[model samples]
Target: SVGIVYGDQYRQLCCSSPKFGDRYALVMDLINAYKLIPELSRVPPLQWDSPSRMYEAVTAFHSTEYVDALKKLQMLHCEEKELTADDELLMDSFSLNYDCPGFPSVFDYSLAAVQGSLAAASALICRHCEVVINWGGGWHHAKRSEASGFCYLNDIVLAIHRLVSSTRVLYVDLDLHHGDGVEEAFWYSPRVVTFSVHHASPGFFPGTGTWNPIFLNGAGRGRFSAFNLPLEEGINDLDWSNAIGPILDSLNIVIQPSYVVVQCGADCLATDPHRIFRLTNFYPNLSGYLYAIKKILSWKVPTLILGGGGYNFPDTARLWTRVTALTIEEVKGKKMTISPEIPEHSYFSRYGPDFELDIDYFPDSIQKHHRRILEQLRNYADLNKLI
Candidate 1:
């Protein structure tokens, strides 16, 4: 099923091999075997290049000191090996120990992700494609001179740099953790509007999006460009879905963006490993991914969908595959929807166990504080004309 789209060599530029990144390869395998996506081989997966271009572009947003730290963040050793003295020094300076370990696997994959995102952004700008989806992009937490929360590079910011040259871009982060790097990157600019819906609790990795007014960036030209809401209670599908339509519905009225980038991190899904440790966090239900994809597509703008954080591989791959199907149709100018059948023997059926894509993870949220949080955010957006 994986044939040619971005030329022969370019199509395989990403980590198509299972050993490179089992989750990404598994999802691709399922997408091909299930035939859930029509004309799978026709999708151009963006040519990959060295991070030289990406690192060059990021200097506009990140400090050279930070870039310098990242430049030496490469390794070709086993992940289990201990970091050398110099390696430890770099890791400490770059915050590369926690989520972003100093391992070759992470380095290689993240580098490819950077290259893919840059190419994807270029495609949007040049009009080579209507919709570009990178299932391996979206590391939105790395800061200018530091790395935190498993993200080594802020690819979202690098991609946005290529876009603001032509049109306003709406950067929406659906990751459970705040998109600190991306939010901070454009927090002081008007060219890119950023909106995030996440669970920001105490001690959460890089927790800084939980401001009472919720709508931030109200000081400079970038004021009103950022509208965000953090869950004050346990997260659920209804809570998440309830917030998206109202937020985007209102924001679209006030500031219609020319392009949109959605960070579809699978970590937001229910029963995700990230939520198991915390009783107060769960993401979406069976229709969560589908409804969200439909809503974003409704905007009908040139969009880039990127993969962020997802600890639960099965559900992550499953939903991402379904989302990929929907996006391809949108790009190809297919008017109708696409809901393909999953073959029993497809790789997806084996990993997901049940061979089912839709499962209601959260259905009980009535009088929760999170619901009130949503109400307050909607009101905030309305008063500020952000809706």
Candidate 2:
């Protein structure tokens, strides 16, 4: 009922050059150390057959030139050579500098990461599992021809395309940053509905997510449906759920989505280095990240759960491990309980003095701005017959 796409090589390539310094490996290793999920949950990892199936899958959404440039850069990294002047210009054009730096075998790494999501998508598409998990995927910042915000490729886009060709898809992004790349990819298409809830302010990264709904008079063109709930800093659980829950209800009631794609970015947690939201994952009386995700899975749609932005490595691992356990519980109707004690793993020292799956939560004021925005969107939806 549940599938997990993972491999030692995939994890190694994800941290090959270290964007966040092997945090990728840490997440997978921690999940393994806990031994939370069932052996039946494991799916065969997608193998890399370079410049063929993986290349074509990546080029499905990315430009040939961009993907080609990445391959060349990967070769250069393998050769331990400096970038050519032309390659330097190309990298500059692609924004392969600060925030998204070019590193060794990044192209191969991107392919591997894309394969992780594709594997999950394939399992779901083949009906091998109703729910699939790919904690290594969810690169929502990469564009068609460029990298952005530490993401080299848009795996979410590729996975959605892979799933949508077979059935309708509802792409839900819970990352702290806007799901810009995936939203923009399907901005004008009715086949896939995009919804994102993220920290959006004046100076945040890639600040483009706002409640802008577009439509036309009885025309399929520009009837594009994209919903965004831009949140502020210090937002607590009550505000997070109150704003997102209603829209999710409307989508589930209205859209006949056969498959669901959830970008389970853990960056919005209170323990994250981003310091934006005060959401929690373990609180019983609180509705936060874990609660919101559980609500989504409750819809019983064949869903693909993906990993996204989460700065605190240990916390991210803890969040995803629990998430995996819940996926099993959601699909199998069985209860899964985990200990607060952090497992003794290689990254044990990273869990600091606590060595537990606990994040400090501060109850903050409830902001009505989210509700106002939700009302505005609901009115627009009603007027445009979206709901």
Candidate 3:
């Protein structure tokens, strides 16, 4: 299937429960479920598949010690009567069982996630699929030996490592949170260009990708490989497009990659109540994604698009549905109907049901913020002769 690979348990992380962000998890899960329902007889009917049963392969990627430790932690949590805010935050970080929590059981889930991600990668590589989206595996905050930011296995990094051995790869991330895990994994490698646009919160989780083009060291020096665009909250379509246009333009000028991987996280959408940004719906966000897709397809690059952090389910569904529909149009040259399962009442229930998708591209409050950043980007580009 060209859709996402997911399971019920994928949403069961400690960060997802009611103790942390249950509403956010519900939104994400609902979106995934809604996207699974295909259009009624538009193009050739696409099949949807569950995540591959590759627990063994995932275990291969994770350490046994980490896996055991995670089990212990889960057991401890179950036995405990209550958890504090600090405890919740710590759980959010440690729940993914990355190398930092270095227990034996922690690696179990990480391996499972990685195996599923590699399965998606293999489908794209060997099955002749034009576009494959995996929603459960964009754990870009995990490092090679340590786990940070609820990510353990760093599936995207592992997939890149496998793909770049033979293919030139371009990694693009549009999550509001930084793509720190993947950037860190390939920071010193030239084979992959890690391009990210996220809220610039330094000293935050993983604390990388906030600055622009933190390039690789050692043999990979001077390759112009990494590009990071740290955006302020409430970024509208124009500024979003503007930031993406030049990066893709520069990438095309420098490294014409053989394959492309895009991570589109929905947390940047304003509809996500938990997020600080004001991307209330999918129209502008999807516009940005389509823009990138058009640019990548111009190079005739085989692409694998993945879903990342979208806490609001309705917004996540809307954005991904638009993305999937656009991908279908781009690849198959056909129109597809997208019926969002979210009702009109449900749409505005949270942000006020009166919220309309036809609102201005950039509200006045956001425009002021974007203008300042736009000026900075323009000045930087001009000084560097990027234009």
Candidate 4:
């Protein structure tokens, strides 16, 4: 069975005061429509408890003091009153001023995301589902005490913490930006391995995971815990498959993870306003992100999928809808054949220009240089030496 975590209240909370106005609401609209499709409607939906439970789960990885401060900030935002100098200082201390703004339901949103992610994690850990999804989660930029890159809480870290107690976890991040918070959380831990494939330049946001860390010095078990595949602009499906396929094979053999957590960020798609990578959501015969996903699912490991940085709202919806269908197909043994035409939904107009579910593709030259980096990474993470 496949489990999904979502609710109207949770959606409302996520829709509140995000820097990307109405993006979450719009994304959910399309997702709900896709789920309503007759054959795909049988997937089970998972539920979570009150904010108190959320606090316990979030505090597992975040500082209690920081969590309480988030509550206070939310209350202040709810009041809609003028802030004192101390309030401004507090928000600034928490990195809430610039990229992450103070919102009325900021704490609620954070808690809701945590709740959904934990529910998905629990369902997977209990063997209640083979593949679980929490599209609202995956705030990988948030830290233990501060928020960054429009994220308030590090739900990915919290979710991974829950899964790490029993099994070896492999975290695969396909976002446009690096999964820095998750990498930092498990920087030295041997049980959990963090792998990220993203655009990494000097001036990128949260620029930490620059290159492969094999040559770098890390103390103890953490020495080989991090694997980063940083690339420049214009990466296509062929190159993505070429680079990631062998690395995943090596990681699967070396780490032998029992569970997999994938952060499917859609900003890498060509339609995204960020204007970075040349990835396509779905090409007829070609598979970019889906190729990676299918490869992971083929391993038959209980997997948890979450959302991340997809700035193009409609395209994000399109990408995740396909992900959901593909998960159902792989896990439930169902045949979900999605047509190119996007079904009508509340936000139907958002899928404009093409009015199709598939994203446009631009021809990109093969990045031959990626192989040299992959060779080094393979040597560093070779099973013979590590395991």
Candidate 5:
């Protein structure tokens, strides 16, 4: 249905590859297989506007030296080059650990993502689409002139910079990990506020967002604008909705963000990797994380949705495809009632026994965690007199 930013240029990368990917291609394929395309507003892949403009976008946050290095890496066919001893040390300083892997076009891959994300912002800025879903974007780990997590380009930050010129932005990350990259990019800015709802496991990768800063990280100095609700454990859709609902409402009231950017990382799904908690998608409807994400788009603000981390391939494909259907369903206000015939042969098709979109639920276990999260948010909101 939505074809923007979908291409084989990103070969081997999870989003472009059908087999090894989280099934991004399959998500679009499944939507078409179900015949849900007519109701949706499909935007063709964007023709990149300008290289100079694209490079200019990231330089706002990244250092010029690193930007030049990234530009140089873009031309090479290899994932990496022979950096001098000092540059190699800079590589380590950039945090290219296991999480942020070395890959071909390390620069261009991030650039393409940045371009697409910036295009999404362009569409929103011009009102081309009420919502633009850049399924391959949402890399919230890359920092200023550095790499972290699996992200080398802070697409979210670059796009937000493009967006802030038009409207105040409220960035919300639903990934399993905190949106440290995006948050840090705008942590000191008053116009752009960032909020993340993460598992926040102790001593986990990029271990921050402990939720004590009034606690916006020490002296609670980063309060009001930046909010991090660290669940630290498993939580279900209902409880999550409960926690984010009030926060969203409060944000609209207080911040009145003219546009919103959401990182709908399905890694928070129960079927996600074992390292992250077995959290489920909060769906008031579909059995899919689809419903919860749909509710997010229905927030009526111009929004940009992007992917982050999702390891559950079968479930991940199911989630994004269903989110596509739901995106149409919301746009049309007409839901698809019957199941679509899943192809007999498709990547990871056998991995899913049901054609319907579905994710696990916590059932009766999340009540206390629900209250715990709620109390923390409410207290912080009250202390800041936000809610």
Candidate 6:
């Protein structure tokens, strides 16, 4: 039976910060819309029926030290007036320096998410499912010892660790920003293959992927374990599709991951002005990526889909809703209508009108740049013999 895991605490952290609170609301709304979809009803409910159940799932994968740190930080926040930039710095310091705020609690919640993931993994193991989608978990930046990029736990790595042994794990990150944390986590581990396709910035946060890792150990044995395909800002559908094709093709050949994880962060959409990379549309880009996943499904591999780093609430909601709808369509063989509930406009309008959800899907010139990026990726793939 397929499993689904979600919780209110996922929304709680955003509530703590006014800057990110509404985005959390949009995520909840998207999940609600996904639950209401009739096609999703066929999947069996696992432990996530209640918030407490989610806590148990989290505990299974998290350490007590980390959980205590989270509680201590929560208490510290409660006594303070609000979280200042200094406070945010302190939070990271506590998490990294003292380990007071157990960043791995991200994995605690991720464990809840993995309840669904493991369920899906089992389905693949038994040939009951070709693909499984879990929308709430993809904390890619959580390192083994420290948490960066708002990711407190590396759920994808943990899940991979639990599900397979000495087998190659292929991970793809499609968020506008690089998946630096995940790439760093498996930097030298040959058992895992990390592939990230994201917008390229010269000196961005957690900068490491600018130069892809060429060799794992001494020679060609580890050369192909990690791949980074960074793109220019403002990508379009065709470019997005072409760029992902070669990466997927390569995975089918050299790596042949026994398990796969896809991080579909919606910040890449042009609608989200706060993000650095500009794209014409998110829907088609995501659709093309999902199509690639469908082709992989035909191979009968265990694939787990997870949500990642999209900051804009409404766009995040829309992307996740669309993804959930597509997953249902694939699993249940039916179409589902998503609700038209508009997000609160007050939160994002200050940035720009483009941040609003009601904007039209007009084609932008960024498509050309993205196309060039795809050509470069294809050339790289050909030279590398990824496929």
Q: Cα lDDT of all candidates, in order?
A: 0.64, 0.78, 0.57, 0.77, 0.65, 0.56
Candidate 5 residue lDDT tens string, 201-242: 667767776645334531243344667767746666556766
Q: lDDT by residue for model 1 over 234-325, one digit each (tens)?
A: 55555567657666665555557788888988777665777621221222333455667668878888888888877666667667766776
Indicate whether candidate 3 or candidate 5 has the larger lDDT. Answer: 5
Model 3 scores a C-alpha lDDT of 0.57
| CA displacement after TM-score superposition, residue 62 of candidate 1 (Å) | 3.5
Candidate 6: segments with Cα more than 4 A from true spot: 1-3, 7-25, 31-36, 41-71, 78-130, 212-223, 278-299, 335-359, 364-387
How much is the lDDT of residue 244 in candidate 3? 69
| Candidate 6: 10-residue stretch with minimal lDDT | 212-221
Please, what are the lDDT tens digits per residue for candidate 3 over residues 189-235?
66677788777765645456554343232124323455666666667
User: RMSD per prediction, one decimal?
Assistant: 5.3, 3.3, 7.6, 3.2, 4.3, 7.0
Residue pairs with backbone atoms closer than 3 Å in model 1 (clashes): 99-150, 250-387, 251-387, 286-359
**For model 1, what is the alpha-carbon lDDT of residue 200?**
75
Residue clash pairs of candidate 2: none
Assess every candidate by TM-score.
0.79, 0.90, 0.69, 0.90, 0.81, 0.68
Considering summed lDDT, which 10 consecutive residues are worst modelled in model 3? 39-48
Worst lDDT 10-window in candidate 5: 11-20
Off by over 4 Å in 1: 1-21, 36-55, 75-87, 212-215, 276-286, 329-352, 359-387
Model 6 quality (TM-score): 0.68
Summed backbone clashes in each candidate are 4, 0, 26, 0, 3, 4
Per-residue lDDT of candidate 4, residues 211-304 (tens digit)? 4443331336666677777777877878877778877777777778889999998888888898888877774635578888988898998999
The model with the greater TM-score, 1 or 2, is 2
Supply candidate 1's per-residue lDDT for 221: 61
Candidate closer to the true structure by TM-score (higher is better), 3 or 5:
5
Please give me the total number of clashing residue pairs in predicted model 3: 26
Q: Model 1, 266: alpha-carbon shift in Å?
A: 1.1
